[PDB]
Write a protein that binds this ligand. Sequence first.
Ligand SMILES: *[C@@H]1O[C@H](CO)[C@@H](O[C@@H]2O[C@H](CO)[C@@H](O[C@@H]3O[C@H](CO[C@H]4O[C@H](CO)[C@@H](O)[C@H](O)[C@@H]4O)[C@@H](O)[C@H](O[C@H]4O[C@H](CO)[C@@H](O)[C@H](O)[C@@H]4O)[C@@H]3O)[C@H](O)[C@H]2NC(C)=O)[C@H](O)[C@H]1NC(C)=O
Ligand code: NB9
Ligand SMILES: *[C@@H]1O[C@H](CO)[C@@H](O[C@@H]2O[C@H](CO)[C@@H](O)[C@H](O)[C@H]2NC(C)=O)[C@H](O)[C@H]1NC(C)=O
Ligand code: NAG
Ligand code: CA
Ligand code: CA
Ligand code: CA
Ligand code: CA
Ligand code: CA
Ligand code: CA
Ligand code: CL
Ligand code: MG
Lengths: 454, 466, 214, 216
Amino acid sequence: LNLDPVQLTFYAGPNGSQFGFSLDFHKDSHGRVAIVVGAPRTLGPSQEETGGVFLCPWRAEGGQCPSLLFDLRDETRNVGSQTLQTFKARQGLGASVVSWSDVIVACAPWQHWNVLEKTEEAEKTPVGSCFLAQPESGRRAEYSPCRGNTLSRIYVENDFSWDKRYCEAGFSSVVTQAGELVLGAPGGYYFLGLLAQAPVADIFSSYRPGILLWHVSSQSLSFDSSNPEYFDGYWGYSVAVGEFDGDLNTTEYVVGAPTWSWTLGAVEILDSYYQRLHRLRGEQMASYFGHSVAVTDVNGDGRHDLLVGAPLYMESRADRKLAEVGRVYLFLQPRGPHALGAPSLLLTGTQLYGRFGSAIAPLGDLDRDGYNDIAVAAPYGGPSGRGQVLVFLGQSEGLRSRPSQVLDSPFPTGSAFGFSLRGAVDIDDNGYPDLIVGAYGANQVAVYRAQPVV
Amino acid sequence: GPNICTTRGVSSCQQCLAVSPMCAWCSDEALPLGSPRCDLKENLLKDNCAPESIEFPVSEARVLEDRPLSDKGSGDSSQVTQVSPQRIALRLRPDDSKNFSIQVRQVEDYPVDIYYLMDLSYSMKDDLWSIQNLGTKLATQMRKLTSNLRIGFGAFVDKPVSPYMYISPPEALENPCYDMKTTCLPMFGYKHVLTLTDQVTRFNEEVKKQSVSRNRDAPEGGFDAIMQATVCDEKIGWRNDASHLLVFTTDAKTHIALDGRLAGIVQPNDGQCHVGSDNHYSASTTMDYPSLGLMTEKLSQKNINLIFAVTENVVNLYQNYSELIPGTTVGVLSMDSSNVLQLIVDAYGKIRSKVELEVRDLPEELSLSFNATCLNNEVIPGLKSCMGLKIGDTVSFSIEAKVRGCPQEKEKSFTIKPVGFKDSLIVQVTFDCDCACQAQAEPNSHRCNNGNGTFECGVCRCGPGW
Amino acid sequence: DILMTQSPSSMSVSLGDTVSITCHASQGISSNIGWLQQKPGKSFMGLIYYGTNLVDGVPSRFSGSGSGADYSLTISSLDSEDFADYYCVQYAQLPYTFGGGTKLEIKRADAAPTVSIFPPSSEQLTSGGASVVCFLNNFYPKDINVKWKIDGSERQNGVLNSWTDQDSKDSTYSMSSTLTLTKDEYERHNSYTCEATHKTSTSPIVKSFNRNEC
Amino acid sequence: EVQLQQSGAELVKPGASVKLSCTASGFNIKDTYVHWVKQRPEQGLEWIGRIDPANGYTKYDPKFQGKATITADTSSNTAYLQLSSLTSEDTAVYYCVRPLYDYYAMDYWGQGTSVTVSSAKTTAPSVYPLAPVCTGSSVTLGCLVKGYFPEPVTLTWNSGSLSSGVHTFPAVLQSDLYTLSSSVTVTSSTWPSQSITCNVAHPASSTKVDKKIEPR
Ligand SMILES: *[C@@H]1O[C@H](CO)[C@@H](O[C@@H]2O[C@H](CO)[C@@H](O[C@@H]3O[C@H](CO[C@H]4O[C@H](CO)[C@@H](O)[C@H](O)[C@@H]4O)[C@@H](O)[C@H](O[C@H]4O[C@H](CO)[C@@H](O)[C@H](O)[C@@H]4O)[C@@H]3O)[C@H](O)[C@H]2NC(C)=O)[C@H](O)[C@H]1NC(C)=O
Ligand SMILES: N=C(N)c1ccc(C(=O)N[C@@H](Cc2ccc(O)cc2)C(=O)N2CCC(OCC(=O)O)CC2)cc1
Ligand SMILES: *[C@@H]1O[C@H](CO)[C@@H](O[C@@H]2O[C@H](CO)[C@@H](O)[C@H](O)[C@H]2NC(C)=O)[C@H](O)[C@H]1NC(C)=O
Ligand SMILES: *[C@@H]1O[C@H](CO)[C@@H](O)[C@H](O)[C@H]1NC(C)=O
Ligand SMILES: [Ca+2]
Ligand SMILES: [Ca+2]
Ligand SMILES: [Ca+2]
Ligand SMILES: [Ca+2]
Ligand SMILES: [Ca+2]
Ligand SMILES: [Ca+2]
Ligand SMILES: [Cl-]
Ligand SMILES: [Mg+2]
């Protein structure tokens, strides 16, 4: 409603770097807000794509940003009569970034890994890896919970069970308020998908450079399955956290699985032991129900609500015709211990191929009316196909069915304006929470400042 | 007596005709002061109205082109007629309606294109063996139904990129089957093999030189191949006047749009052709899988009848996809494709067992309604699609066109076309809302309030600007 | 296999010293080395892993260093609990192989041994055996040699020695030597002596007794 | 806390077989490799092998191929070392080891399990007094403990009374049996004035003999 679309702020990265693929707000130890931007195709030292991260100080004029530096060199260790190697070429560092306290977590989901033992090998596969930095102190750490040293022959003899070689850990990521990092790995267990969790403190204290294979004893991974409904389901394509079981001492996980059960799609709520509390089934096959999830209480009852994006949902139109426009589902949490029922509201896109619902960002209370609000992205929507971001305000019954404000892309065609979103933080300290929008196709980030209600 | 043509009290000829399709206007000088000039045409001649001064247009519908339906689709450079009539002239007065007819025939001996798009991942190794004679065997059976058959061939596996592709050791890149005791081709996304030709032994000899490859994950990139086989007109060789059959055979699930992000691929599918002279799909490693909606658009745009010929273990999956891609047929393929011949013959019969009408460019102010005559001279009100047909059958439809009011533009044309057919019916509509006496008015007429008005059709109208 | 040559065999030092053990490998092991501690009469404790990384809970006076095939463990300012055994271990290749060991001992001024010879007992002789015992108590350094002489001539067969750890109070070592003869062979001779060679004397410290005589 | 509690000390005959245990307390034994190490005073430390309790796979030093068998039961959170066709050379203390962080390290150690191979029976010791020969300011006595099996024994002068200035020496194996001796030093005025006594207790055969030191 009250986001300023006239005076924007633009940050830019190098050409072809996909600067803006992911972003988040970052508060330093003194509470100063900055923007962490991922650029998963930034050129490394060898003039090869490896990815990179940028830490943008807040300036109303925007501009260039300094680099948050990470080790981009491939590593080799000969130990235990084996050879461990990491491959950072085209790893996509910055395909996801998230911030917690004064720590930044940036992940390279396509970092490859292999183990050599005489003539045998583990197979060069994308296990992924996340990089952790404390910018003010310069401290660095890594976390790669799917690296292994089992040889390829063993997986074949055991029918590829507990096969963590294709995790792509860091595909999606989130941190609990207590400091538990939770990673999505949709290629886990031969493309079923898994979750990997560990405290940020234990990641730092157990890491030493050059080890490549180490234990984080406090970590906890999800489990493999024999159920064909989960095969090729990409469980962990998107992840989020919230409070859904009434007990305020436990943190619940929300996991998107957009190809679950033969591309029907699903979203599941779990406790921190990965036991399942609820499952939301997709409405239409191949709609990618679960592509995006977000957790926020929109109707002001203190109970976290859930929205699910299905960006490829095909809406029924005249003459038995379907139109791919996208759809967002809202699930209000009922009182006490009960199951999330049918959707409370269905928001459906308008522009063909607009992919309405590709990203869903909680805004906090934008207009300061006591109810929390959201922003939904249609990166190829709008009358010109350049992309739109639509704001929906909360109310006592959930969300408004029509947008209070639409943000048209300020970038050229093909920028994917809205592919990444992040709100609910006051970056200019004016008392109203703001919105940063990534356009990786244009290698830029746009900042929308909220203003007093007109 | 006092009808709605008079009781409503008109002011001009145009206002008279727009009251009801039955009203007429009398543009005669000799007419009593109290007598009306906007009445039923009978009551006007009853009141000595000069017949030439009567404005009463009638809604009509006369055919312009009326070729007869062909008996054989053979011969001709597509001088075949499967819709009759092909063009009519429709004329409506305000708020009036008129009905017309159309005949549609599933013409016998129509040319047929069949492009065989084959999964060539490792589990199809035995399938290749049982179809080494398909080109000739299929030519034998299709010769009973058409004398113009063309067949072609293409193959797919998946996007040749990690993690779909084995990338270590270097030997695995040239031979993905290295850690077994065999040799298979390097991984390929989609390759065109044989442009559509009537030399069916080209099919057999090309297939005998084909071999399989191997990849890591169970879903395959067949949708990439369906898109390229559809939008690469020249390379595949579809004909402008032939039923286009695209036979898609696989024994596994399929990748869909937004799956490519596990290979680092985020760029949406652009729906354009990317198969060059090397006959390989060059955007396989840089462009995401196509979505069901984009696949539907191109199949409908190129008149491709897609056939899912898949094994029992995935027939429910593809049956559910075909419901999201209207016009798609599904058949059950044996574990070695040994039954693919009868599968294609039955899919062609199902494809040509339906006639569904379609309306294009219909004006907002025109509404249409349909009565269908299928099977045996039975009328089915409110229906525009026949089913259960056979090659050579003929059906017909009765259309009524009602116009609401009278639009600004007086000439518009729309189209009635059966889904998938080349022929169509072009309806040229003219809206007859004016009187011919209006094209001969007197601006600034002396008899009209000292030149303050205009004289038309025997009455004085207020001039422009008043 | 990979040989771990750990030096020195032992060392005598004092509290507050800065000492350094070393470990040489038969080939390059690229810092894949650990250092261990075994306090007297107890199990092991990890000190270093991967050449330079302290195990959790280890004081910072410990430190590791080295590269290629040569590594070193350093203890800046020795503590009292640091006097124990230390081993290096490689894990660059299977099988894992350990170093020989290195005992840290307390340094102090030299002390001469207190020799004492004890003829066989009346009870033991009546059973058929005869054992002459010789105690060498409280000396430093640990190195010492005992020589048994029967009728002036050296005797090597049938001797049984035993040592004690560095005593907690005086930091001195002690030794027990035992010659065991049959009763029949014990009486074929008259003189019985144990000679003690120590760096605290060029002349061997001697004590003896003649059978029958007292 | 990470603790490795091994089974109690074993005592067996040559040719027989023994099976040791290593129980994980405070963690899941499935987490890391579990190694076994053998310690002898002369030969030093030797690496037997390892097991990955997550999947039961093992590695071995070829020196121990045949004698050593490593298994693990994730149910009871315990690993095992089985030794077969035992020998004198198989007499040592066995430790189970696991790493802290580095996958291949050796950081946490169990307390150690003592194994002793012998055909010897339960034999009681033979206490002998040791009086000097027919002078100075100091005087030293002694006691001899010969031919007992198995270990250990407790030796006290005057039943814990005389403690300072005493040396008891580690036992030594003399052909399938152990032997130990202890000395004691006082002043010349103390002896033969006061009565000093050697108190030897061997609980295995349940014996507590005591000899008084008599001069010559
Ligand atoms: C291809 O598409 C078909 C059609 O949608 C899918 O088949 C459906 O699968 C769903 C999920 O398994 C089935 O849903 C279940 O419906 C049951 C009632 O259906 C009855 O009535 C229909 C009428 O048409 C019959 O066809 C059917 O056989 C039954 O007799 C419910 O009892 C089930 O409820 C249970 O599960 C749900 C979760 O799904 C829980 O919420 C419930 O509490 C309860 O535990 C269930 O809802 C549906 O019946 C199927 N339809 C048909 C026609 O078979 C295929 O799965 C799909 N295949 C692929 C590969 O995509
Ligand atoms: N964690 C689980 N529950 C789970 C584990 C594994 C799987 C899975 O898919 N394994 C694989 C095992 C396999 C078989 C043949 C081969 O050569 C290579 C690998 C599988 O069966 N394929 C289906 C067929 C396909 O053949 C190759 C081709 O078509 O080119 C490869 C994958 C699914 C779920
Ligand atoms: C389609 O058929 C219906 C009959 O089911 C026709 O509707 C009837 O038309 C006659 C014409 O005089 C009327 O008298 C009836 O009252 C109508 N019946 C209804 C409306 O239920 C209809 O006209 C036909 N239309 C076309 C285009 O063929
Ligand atoms: C309209 O329908 C009538 C019968 O209802 C039919 O006689 C007439 O031919 C139809 N009009 C045209 C143009 O065919
Ligand atoms: Ca909770
Ligand atoms: Ca709520
Ligand atoms: Ca609000
Ligand atoms: Ca603000
Ligand atoms: Ca087959
Ligand atoms: Ca595949
Ligand atoms: Cl700009
Ligand atoms: Mg396959």
